[PDB]
Homo-oligomer: 322 residues x 6
């Protein structure tokens, strides 16, 4: 109930997409629990516990699709709950929250570096890589492959409505990587000159399906058509535990004004609806490998990743639950 | 040569895409040769012949990909050239041109209403139709189905870079037709709820291939993946003669600042190139039917349409050449 | 208005499927106009003309899907109308009707013999042929191939709900042809031992799509999956002229009691609906050749067949129209 | 050996398909070994051991294709065999058998309710579900989605030769669920209006393949053609151990008179054979998920389910052998 | 009965593949007929007519698969037979033969030249072209493209068993075209670097299937897999008139010593059979265009080449027949 | 530094392909290490350890593509290195090496035997089997099946460039198995008569792709096209641990004189380059099963073979490294 404003700002910024990208939203949420814990004026363990739960709920209710966010909160809160129910004093519980958040953040960073190291080995001298949206994990791969001295070019799709491709383009450019910027529509037209595809992931399912920025499935489709390897770069905390037990991932429908700006949209007739899904789902047949910090896998081994790391917790309710 | 201003203004406006759509471009090309003949001050027939030769060369060098443009110029100038070589005096030559051009414009209008009526019979009540870009022909089909009392909805894809989807959305919505506007990247995500795809053409080749707005081949591809019918609404003047003798269609590369505005692009790193192809090429196997003013065809019958309407002219030179 | 009962019985028998099969229904309808004409008590040409029109309407309104029926009636009635409007006396008009019907019947028979002769050449010694429903044209092929001394076996699908396969099985057996009878569901399971598929057609469209007995499209689908040639055996009067101008073929929905017998069906809860489509539509991609009396064609050449034989009449209303 | 009558009556009833469905067969197999142990008059443990050995051999030789049967027998007899070899006295051996069998029956029931709850989460409100044959597991999924308030309709395919579709149609309709009954041949025609396919399994192989009622592979095939999800509701006791070591599953050929009744078939020509396979084999690539009581898997994870639940037993002999 | 030396040498050189390549073979058979007429010591019309009839049969009975050969003998003998039946005297008949063969040969050289010109237009600067066997018409395309100043590289598949690829590689090298030579099995491995596939044909059928050197089908298949264009370079006398009326093309089975040499094969166990198909059949779905001397067709328009250039003769027997 | 004669002969025999076949090569490298330890005149532990390290590098540097080789050197040197670091004396170290090589070699012979037994079960009486190259493990399957009394026939693809298929054909003949020998290009032509495809592997990756003799991929592709099962017979030491961490397998490019002999190649134009890839890569989607000595897997479970038998060593450097 005495929730610090750093939690409230992180939430608003997640919603507004000032903080965006699956890994980043996750790190931002770990962070927010950290700050809440650091700054809490609680006197009993029970008071802090309550704050961490209510803050976790606020943070969870921001954006649904990327499972990295709930996974970050679970990492922190599985540990916090266990300390709490085990009778931890106020300070043991504060540190358990703070240090758990710190680990997630630190492991998130090492996981992305490691993915780049692993992914890069699948890039070859002279490769033309097509990507989509802005993925820290995808970019780690392309960036490392350049640093090894491979001469790559990267086709960057624009990624409407939010123009994520601009970010990716400028960022790749600044590491010395040449870029070809194209609109989303042109992905089939350039698939013939493309040697590899490398994209990120918001959530990966028990069957190997990849939920990622709207348009990912199209690029994968025509990549398959063309026999261009589709490689997805993704941390194990992108894997979705609830889909083990039959859960479908919700696809976020964002405001129509991200597609068509406010001033214009209200001049339009009432019988036009603008629909703005932030993600689509890419079937496993169309994915060559998923690149995790633990190694290369075929998409269908998503279940192993889920079994050995996340399944244990599916008997329990969420660690923030009241 | 004394070229009248309406010839130059039309060429500017085609190049700038102020005038756009392969059907319109073609009518305006004819309209321009008509205005040249109307206002010419030529004394001799040879004087006027030369004006129209040159006028045609100006118009032909505007935009290369939609063969409708040269087929309009040809429709007028084969006639003008035969009048002139067969000894026509001046005012005979002036009317051959005027009248040939009025013929093309009125047949063009006719063909579109006719493609509407034919193509509508392949629209079923309840259908959800996905379309791309803005095509007077495709719209004729959708609008004619609506006027028949069928309850349709049209999925209008945005169509970057130039936003042609906005024109389409507003146009259809203004005839009463419910519209759903989405980004091009959302085509696959919404292909499951789509019953029919209806699109235009700029060029159609001997072998069946359809050159139409960039992103057309993606929509068609994922329509095939899902067994949604891809119907191309296209006049016979969209069919490309030189492809019979082995020609590939030039795919127009338009200025990059149509993608990223000048103000923003000049601030971007030197090693990003923006590539802006205006069109892509959809293979025949992803096309179900081509709705011409002469009836429904399989796309492989493109060659029949060309054999019987264009072949004769191929042993000759272009009717505006020296 | 003074319509003979032979017209009324032929109609009832077409509806009830006592007379069934596309070619046969067509011959039966030609026949019926013949008898009407033979037995008419008309005294003026105008009186007979009226009878032939009203009889054509009755016969046309029996079953929609197989276009052979309207084509048979057009063959007879294009000729009758032309005699009539050209001032034929009563007897000239009677004979025009009678003799036209006779030609259609005679040409129908020669067309089926000729298809068998042509089709059989595509069967090879040792072939295992899978078929579907009961097609006179298909059977003509298999029968001729045996008579040439090729040792074939024919897999006969049962063809529910009406058990057409029983007819085909007994009929092939009686020519010396060994038969393997299987239920419809088993077609994929036996496609591996199948060398050829040979089926009939009720209506063939401008784009090469084949409308035929329910389940045809499944057999073709898994045939394609397996690279087994799908050959359709079909007379040129199976080709559908209205689909040139964008008409979709109606798919006949027959009584639910053909699926589930009356005594049983009325014991069932109201919230079960039985749906009984008599046909499905098979796309051209899944058809290797159509075998007509005029020769082997790829499915997509359906338009040539339609252009050169049926298109001339599409400017006119139906020759029975009032 | 003194085999009790309920062992023989159950074997007759499995063979005749009076008792049917791989789940039921398996429970009744266990039920029979339970009744044998209940009523045995054995004095020694060795006497009873031998009765159960023989009882198991009788039950195992009824119907070969659904591995659920032997997995039930194994579940009981690995336990009984270990009790006996580990010196158990008589009434200990009698209870090991009884209790092992009650265990299997109650776990089987549990697994089905559980597969209902998991699989329902992949059913979305509004969905039209196509199913095949009659599967308690598939029905558990569909019924559980309905109880959640989702408005579904189920397309029940008839399922020749034995008409299992009638059982399914009546069952689902009796829980309130709207049913559409069609013939197996209509599967493709109605795949366009279908959102999800839900079916059972009799055996599932190491590599992912699903053996289920004849016609299953057709439905799955055309589901893939249209990108409709194929979900297999199947317990872990449906998974086939011997396939790990290279075994192919025997596909049961049932008496031809189930297709064509004795009265009719005896009148048919000698060179028609009726072939009645009871099952077909659907490849893994046409399967989206397998819903087990342990959660959603990709079909290629069949091998994991077998490794961790069945592999150990493969170096041993069958637990009812000499 | 009095057949010239040359007809025998031509025949034998064709049998042993000393003269080879569909077009060349046909030229050699026209040449033979031409020399039979030149050197005839016949004095009656009927004596010559009989020499030419027999000469034809000898030639037609060398090698079955390439229809070019009978199409050449028909070109000559149709004309010879029309003259002989007109009552043409000896010297008129002798010239009919002599001239018709020269007309055939000259039109053949012209077609291959024109195919080069037309086909070259579909080659683009920087293209890598995979070919197969040695096709004069395929080579015309490649050579003309290279002469146009396009920097192409050609991948020459070795083409077992007769090592045809060595001839192709040496030939293209000799015009200054960089060749990559590879074994047949490597065609998929290098399909990713291939932009275009260009190959010949021995026979093209009524449905658009292409019969060419063994392996042609594997290359078309993996080319389709990767969306590389397959372009067939083929004179209109490669199209097979018999296939219109149902015939299948005979696939010539040549000597096993062309595979395993005689000195080695004789030492091998009896129970190894060496099979040497000289050709295979590529379906039209894997073929993008056929480049003929009349233009570009989709494979499905082969029926038109046939309808319009050959169908007239099918009514009749082969000209050389009695 | 003091390396035995035999290590050099083994190395050179492997380089020149005198010793060939992935499994055999590996046995030859274990053998070499075994003879280095046997014949060492070293007197300190460290002297031997250094001989074996160097011997290993020599061997690993012969042929890159078949991972069996390093997996054998690892089997031995992991064990040798654990001993040397335990402080093992000279003779203990010498035995560690000698025994570990014998263990490797004996386990290899056992695996190939067990693969035969397991793989044979998926062969059925009357099967026609296409194979490629010469794989000891593929042959084990075929031989065991034939020994079981199944009347099989084997199609042996010739396998250029090194004529591997002659070895296979002679070998299978020698066990009494009828062979059909065909050139590589004929694999599609005979895929219709093929029931089963059985081939070896040199390296199998973490995502299930198979690296085997050049051509393997063309056969898998057309086998998939026709729904023929592709079964790979492969010892678990064919699985590539490096591919888990991102590596690509190096495709060995061997001498051009293995393609075109030296006496002939030297006469050829400079501008023909002869490319000799010894291997290609088959994707997992075209592979039905991998038959290992631990059982049948889908190709996607290759990651499990790896996770569980090799992943432990990836943390560390190669045993022979300093
Ligand atoms: N050198 C290599 N090492 C490991 N995997 C490879 C290599 N080359 C190709 N692949 C894989 O092999 C398959 C190639 O398939 P395609 O893209 O269809 O050629 C894919 O599954 C790739 O991941
Ligand atoms: O974790 P990293 O690799 O940064 O990003 C993964 C994915 O998350 C992003 O979505 P959004 O911008 O949050 O809507 C993009 O879809 C991207 O592919
Ligand atoms: O001729 P209509 O049917 O109106 O449209 C035909 C096509 O021409 C347009 O190109 P652009 O906007 O001129 O670049 C669009 O691609 C459209 O589909
Ligand atoms: O075990 P449950 O899930 O109820 O059904 C599993 C399968 O077993 C049945 O076979 P049969 O009717 O015994 O021949 C059907 O094929 C059904 O899908
Ligand atoms: O007429 P051109 O285009 O030269 O060759 C056509 C085809 O004929 C040849 O066969 P063969 O060498 O006669 O056995 C080759 O297969 C070639 O592709
Ligand atoms: O171990 P086994 O199963 O015998 O053979 C495995 C594979 O290794 C061989 O290559 P190479 O002859 O070494 O170049 C063949 O390609 C074969 O399929
Ligand atoms: K590419
Ligand atoms: K749809
Ligand atoms: K659907």
């Amino acid at each position: 109930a005495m929730i610090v404003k750093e939690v409230y700002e992180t939430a608003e910024k997640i919603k507004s997409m000032e903080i965006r990208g699956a890994g980043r939203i996750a790190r931002a949420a770990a962070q927010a629990l950290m700050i809440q814990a650091e700054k809490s004026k609680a006197k009993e363990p029970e008071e802090l516990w309550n704050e961490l739960k209510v803050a976790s709920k606020i943070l969870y209710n921001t954006r649904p699709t990327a499972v990295s966010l709930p996974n970050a909160l679970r990492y922190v809160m599985h540990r916090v709950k266990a300390a709490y129910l085990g009778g931890a004093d106020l300070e043991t519980l504060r540190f358990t929250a703070i240090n758990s958040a710190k680990e997630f953040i630190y492991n998130s960073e090492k996981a992305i570096e490691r993915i780049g190291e692993i992914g890069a080995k699948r890039i070859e001298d002279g490769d033309i890589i097509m990507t989509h949206s802005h993925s820290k994990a995808a970019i780690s791969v392309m960036k490392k492959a350049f640093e090894q001295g491979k001469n790559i070019k990267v086709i960057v799709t624009e990624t409407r409505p939010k123009w994520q491709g601009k970010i990716t383009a400028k960022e790749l450019a600044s590491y010395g990587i040449p870029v070809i910027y194209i609109v989303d529509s042109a992905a089939r037209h350039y698939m013939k000159m493309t040697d590899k595809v490398v994209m990120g992931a918001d959530s990966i399912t028990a069957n190997g399906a990849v939920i990622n920025k709207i348009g990912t499935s199209l690029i994968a489709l025509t990549a398959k058509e063309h026999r261009v390897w589709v490689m997805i770069a993704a941390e194990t905390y992108k894997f979705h535990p609830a889909t083990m037990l039959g859960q479908l991932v919700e696809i976020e429908m964002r405001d129509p004004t991200e597609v068509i700006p406010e001033e214009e949209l209200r001049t339009w007739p009432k019988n036009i609806e603008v629909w703005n899904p932030a993600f689509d789902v890419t079937p496993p047949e169309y994915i060559d490998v998923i690149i995790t910090e633990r190694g290369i896998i075929p998409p269908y081994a998503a279940i192993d990743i889920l079994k050995e790391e996340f399944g244990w917790a599916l008997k329990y309710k969420e660690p923030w639950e009241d």
